[PDB]
Design a protein around this nucleic acid. Structure first.
Lengths: 151, 117, 51
RNA sequence: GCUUGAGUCUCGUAGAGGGGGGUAGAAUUCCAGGUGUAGCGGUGAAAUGCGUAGAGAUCUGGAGGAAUACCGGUGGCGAAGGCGGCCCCCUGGACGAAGACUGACGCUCAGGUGCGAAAGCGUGGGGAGCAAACAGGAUUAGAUACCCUGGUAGUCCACGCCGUAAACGAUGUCGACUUGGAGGUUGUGCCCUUGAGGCGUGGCUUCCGGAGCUAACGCGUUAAGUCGACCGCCUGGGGAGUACGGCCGCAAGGUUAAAACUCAAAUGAAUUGACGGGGGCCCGCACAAGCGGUGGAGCAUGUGGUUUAAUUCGAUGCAACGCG
């Protein structure tokens, strides 16, 4: 990244719904190279999400993830010998990457039984935008809203 | 109240703070707003953003007068001033004149020493 | 110093103050009376203006 | 005696040359008043400070002091220090054009005399801004500083003193000769002035360079080149431009000016490198963007230490510490 501008590698889409978005979601959730376990958790959790909300699968996922995507985020500069937290507009791939990282991280924070219930309840708490990942999004937006004076 | 319908926006941009005072053509102030009185104390009260929200807030608080035309008089340098007049024609004012009235001495008083920072 | 315009106007476009007052003349009169640094600042300004 | 040195006269030119007097416009501060309202100011961030007893902002009127934006220019003038609005008065010098006059009247100069930034001193005024001292706030390990908020002498005027500066082109004065180029500034002559031209001829000045000189760097017709006249000064570093004495000074101090002792260097310019909280360009899981660890727990293993009869020896920033 000093010199090398890069490409990006193409991920295989989801084997049940053909969604590369949800494929990157099972990669964000995966730990220790265990992908089967993570896709089992995602299929169970989103299956009970589709059963609970009654909408469908990945539009319930797409709504619950649409409520947690950040708009702008702070970022350090260190240009004039000072520490500024400037607000900067998030790229779309980074936008939903941060969305999924906050959903998964907040779901790991929860205190329910199984991971499919922690993440199904976290996506359900994000569908009416009252969970923890929405508090992370509102927190990011308070930081970039307080420091709006730098652009 | 009193229904003046034309005023002057004296904007006083300095390096640390911009202070916008909307008055009439006689010179009697009708309401003011500073960048430091709009939140963002400190390194953030001298920015174009702070000056524009100062000017938005000074456009409010003169609704009681029905000002439509105004001249703009600009003092001092500053990160403000330019953005400041923008905020004024983002607040429905018909901006008539833009004069820059920075006080320049004709080699008058001795300026202070300073700044071996 | 003044500007005005009739109803075809959109932008400020007052670059009369990148002509005279703002950039140099007020930032110059913020700091010390020398007699000494200006003689050398002007000496090296006119010694830099060379081909 | 003579005119090619020096000087006088005639006519103009440019100029922040000097001294005295007056005036003008912007701006800062203060005072009085109107509007108006919650901050202003300040900083890297803050706080001290000012502010609902109404600040800051804004308008009107007044007072006062200092300095004189733009023009403004390696532009000008002055012996040097230095001199910057505009106007008047008194006054010094320079330069140019043609002609006339005196006729070597010249050059330098120890002692001597004068002028001599700034700070400082004396007496009397003045005092807006700025600001040693000083005070407070910060910063910091400390901060008798840098930064912030105030702030007295001083800076300004009159007269006297001081008598120095990196008072520097670190280059004494006067004169003569020795290839060039580009400018600036101020005169003057000639030619269709056929315009903001062309050709010369002086004065002052800036940059670059030739020969030559120079340790080199550089100087280079304004010499640090080639010569002549007279003056000033130098003789290793420190001690020391100090002590004692003299002269000067109100004082601060100034000037003239040693020795003992001590070192074998001190110095100049340039070269190679290294370094820089100098500059430009560029790279690496270097940072950033992420994911997983270590430091916490138990154990394994190595080391330091301690113990021991011995706890064999070696490895110890990175690049020793389950290493030999």
């Amino acid at each position: 990244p000093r010199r090398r501008v890069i490409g990006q590698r193409k991920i295989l889409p989801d084997p049940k719904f053909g969604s590369e978005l949800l494929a990157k979601f099972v990669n964000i959730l995966m730990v220790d190279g265990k992908k089967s376990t993570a896709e089992s958790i995602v299929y169970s959790a989103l299956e009970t999400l589709a059963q609970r909300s009654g909408k469908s699968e990945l539009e319930a996922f797409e709504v619950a993830l649409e409520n947690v995507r950040p708009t702008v985020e702070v970022k350090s500069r260190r240009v004039g010998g000072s520490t500024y937290q400037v607000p900067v507009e998030v790229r779309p791939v980074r936008r939903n990457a941060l969305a999924m990282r906050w959903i998964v991280e907040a779901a790991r924070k929860r205190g329910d039984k199984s991971m499919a219930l922690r993440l199904a309840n976290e996506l359900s708490d994000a569908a009416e935008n009252k969970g923890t990942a929405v508090k992370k999004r509102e927190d990011v937006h308070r930081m970039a809203e307080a420091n709006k004076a730098f652009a | 109240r009193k229904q003046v319908s034309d005023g002057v926006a004296h904007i006083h941009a300095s390096f640390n703070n911009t202070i916008v005072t909307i008055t009439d053509r006689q010179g009697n102030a009708l309401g003011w707003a500073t960048a430091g009185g709009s939140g963002f104390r400190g390194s953030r009260k001298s920015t174009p953003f702070a000056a524009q929200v100062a000017a938005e807030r000074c456009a409010d608080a003169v609704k009681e007068y029905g000002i439509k035309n105004l001249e703009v008089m600009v003092k001092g340098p500053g990160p403000g001033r330019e953005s400041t007049i923008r905020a004024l024609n983002a607040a429905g004012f018909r901006i008539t004149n833009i004069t820059d009235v920075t006080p320049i001495p004709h080699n008058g008083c001795r300026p202070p020493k300073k700044r071996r920072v | 110093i003044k500007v005005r315009e009739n109803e075809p106007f959109d932008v400020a476009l007052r670059r009369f103050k990148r002509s005279c007052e703002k950039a140099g003349v007020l930032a110059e009169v913020r700091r010390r009376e020398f007699y000494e640094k200006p003689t050398t600042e002007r000496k090296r300004a006119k010694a830099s203006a060379v081909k």
